[model samples]
Target: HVEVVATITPQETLIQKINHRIDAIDVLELRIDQFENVTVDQVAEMITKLSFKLLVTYRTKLQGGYGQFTNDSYLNLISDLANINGIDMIDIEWQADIDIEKHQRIITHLQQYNKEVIISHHNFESTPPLDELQFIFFKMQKFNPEYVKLAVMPHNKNDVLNLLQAMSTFSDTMDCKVVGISMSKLGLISRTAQGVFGGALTYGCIGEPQAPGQIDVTDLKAQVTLY
Candidate 1:
């Protein structure tokens, strides 16, 4: 089954708001970079009250997120989060500014903690060619992550198909789960076609748009199931 991932930025009333909707979500992604003035311990505390699997993401400004972190600090934050028992997984950008050796080390660290490592790549500009997309997926798979996620902007109808085709191919031949998306209105169909393309997870926003073409959790859940 394709899992629905709902994202939320930490706020004063975050717990109260998301707690009630636990039944509808398969995973809750904490956009940690957007959690200003919040400590890792505080975030862990918040996770304690929630009942869904937790996926932590700290996106840099270059990765379409609001926060900026130096390479060292970014790795440090992820390392710190690894020890948080409540967290089930952590997203590490395959294109993060850190060196490959360092990325490998962090992945190892997270694995030791039994955290599902998601090596993700996002192309906000436009989707790459089919061959390039497949090449990227293979390169990321070398990291031995539990999931390989690729999200790109689609300029036209073909771009969206390329993304879905890539996902279908990856799932057919590989042992890992692939989370793929073609962003914006032009690519919205891919969001609801997760099962069709063999996508393992799809993101839906709890409130505001976390990424382009993000649908609401309730509406997305309905649509994903209706398919």
Candidate 2:
């Protein structure tokens, strides 16, 4: 079954959301980069209180997030996050400024700590061509992470299809689970289409979508179930 991932940006209503669990969310994603004024210790405290499987993402500023993390700092932070008991996975952008040796070392370190690494890539500007998408996927796959995620903005309906094509192709060719998303309203269908098209997971918003085109978590879960 396709898992529904509910993303939350820790802030005022964070505790309320955690305490009063939202229905139909299979996993909870903490966009740590979006955590404003919240210390790592405070975040760890909240992690201990949550029962849902957790995925932590702290995207770099260059990766379209608020994080100002340099490559080394990001790797260091990921190592720290992996040691946190409740964190099941850590998202490391595939475009991270690290070379192959660094990638191997980080992956090895994460594995030693029993942490799953989700290598991800995002293009907020526009979707690339099919060949390029395949190239990106293969590059991430070479690192042998458990999962690889791709998010891109579509210029038109055809661009949306291009993403789906890549999703379908990746599903057919690879063993690593792929989370595919198309940004904006035009790409909303792709969120639910994961099940039909072979994507392993889809993201949804708990309160507000941290990204474009995300359905509310409950609604997205229901939609995926309909398949």
lDDT winner among the candidates?
1
What RMSD does each model have against the real structure?
A: 1.7, 2.0
Q: Output the worst ten-in-a-row residue range by lDDT, candidate 2.
A: 11-20
lDDT of each: 0.86, 0.82
Worst lDDT window (10 residues) for model 1?
11-20
Give the runs in model 1 whose Cα sits over 4 Å from its true position.
36-38, 96-98
Query: What's model 1's lDDT at 216?
Result: 81
lDDT per residue, candidate 2, 33-121, as tens digits? 86654455766887776645789888877877898766777777777776787888888887745587887788878878888889999
TM-score of 2: 0.92
TM-score leader: 1
Over 4 Å off in model 2, which ranges? 18-21, 36-40
Cα lDDT of model 1 by residue, 1-227, tens digit = 78888988765465666765676689999887876644678778877756567899988778888767778888888888898998999999877444989899999999999999999999899899999999899889888899999999999999999999999999999999998899997888888878778998999888787889988877778888987
Superposition TM-score, candidate 1 onto the true structure: 0.93
Estimate candidate 1's alpha-carbon lDDT, on a 0 to 1 scale. 0.86
